[PDB]
Design a protein around this nucleic acid. Sequence first.
DNA 1: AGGACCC
DNA 2: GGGTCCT
Length: 373
Amino acid sequence: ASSRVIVHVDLDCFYAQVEMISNPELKDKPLGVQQKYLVVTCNYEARKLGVKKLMNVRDAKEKCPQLVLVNGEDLTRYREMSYKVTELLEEFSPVVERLGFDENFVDLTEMVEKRLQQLQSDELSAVTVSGHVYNNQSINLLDVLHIRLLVGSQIAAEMREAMYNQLGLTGCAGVASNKLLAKLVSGVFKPNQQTVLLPESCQHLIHSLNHIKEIPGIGYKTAKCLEALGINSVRDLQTFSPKILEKELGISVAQRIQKLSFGEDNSPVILSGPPQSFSEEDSFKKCSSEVEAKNKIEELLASLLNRVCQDGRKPHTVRLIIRRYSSEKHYGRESRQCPIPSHVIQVMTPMVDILMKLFRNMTLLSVCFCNLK
DNA sequence: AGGACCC
DNA sequence: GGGTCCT
Ligand SMILES: Nc1nc2c(ncn2[C@H]2C[C@H](O)[C@@H](COP(=O)(O)OP(=O)(O)OP(=O)(O)O)O2)c(=O)[nH]1
Ligand SMILES: [Mg+2]
Ligand SMILES: [Mg+2]
């Protein structure tokens, strides 16, 4: 099992789609989904009118005064539809990895091979692509890698069709030989379109990026380190001294990020299955005095309990997260956790009680249940 | 507990 | 306003 066919599915303006489906009157109006002072996402009509993702509400409403806004602080419906998407994809092939609420990877390698064994040495030359070919690259029908990726594009088109027919949702897909490249290529044509990457255009796709932060896997901190070292482009990263990179980022981060800079990524698509943790949050800048705010911890709990119940499995740990404030230097939240007594596993008041103590041990209040069994 | 990453 | 896995 060497060469892979991977699809990355990435839905369009996910919370906005869900809001437009719920309230048809919002369809073909420019629409922003708001959380506190942020317009976290907006539909493609708003993006034509200036509105950007994670743009603050003011900038957004003076870029576009008629922008309609709906509150998206409660994730219940987005989370529900998100699992519907994953389950539908799992029906195509069972190893589906989630990334956030609206991206999924599927390893289609077995499915592609089974479809190939089913065509004769006649219709093999009838194989055609579905959707865009990255960089308008010519297909070579005698290249077995090209043929597999095209069958991969046909499977992806069937996935996007089923999503739309069964769930009312549109999205993009990217088909490529690994997860890094499938995820880079899925965003090439948006919204609601798909693209496949043939191997000869891999360097073109990688060099299309304008900074190494654009590479999935390289974040805020790593990008700052590389900068400090004079590394700005993908090519700077590709040509940089492996030794020097090793003894600066650790052998782990360094060998992996350098491979990514070439388009190389051996990481497997992992079956996400059910979630590992369940949390709810609330934000209020300045607002929590450190006493008159327990009632908040009680709401978070009431709502979580219903979710964790419905799941069918139970958590064996609970955690309280907080954020403090005086100025905005970089990062730092705070957590205390402890196990959940097993009497209480099998509800409110004793949980309120455990939490009010983890509080006393210690803007933001969140509760997180984890260590599910 | 907290770090880095992700959407 | 959520999530993942590693140290
Ligand atoms: N609060 C918050 N929500 C986010 C953040 N990133 C993503 N989300 C939510 C809003 C999105 O609708 C959903 C999926 O994230 P994506 O990056 O795919 O953006 P979205 O689908 O809206 O846009 P797209 O059409 O994919 O460009 O997750 C973030 O940094 N903060
Ligand atoms: Mg995305
Ligand atoms: Mg999306």
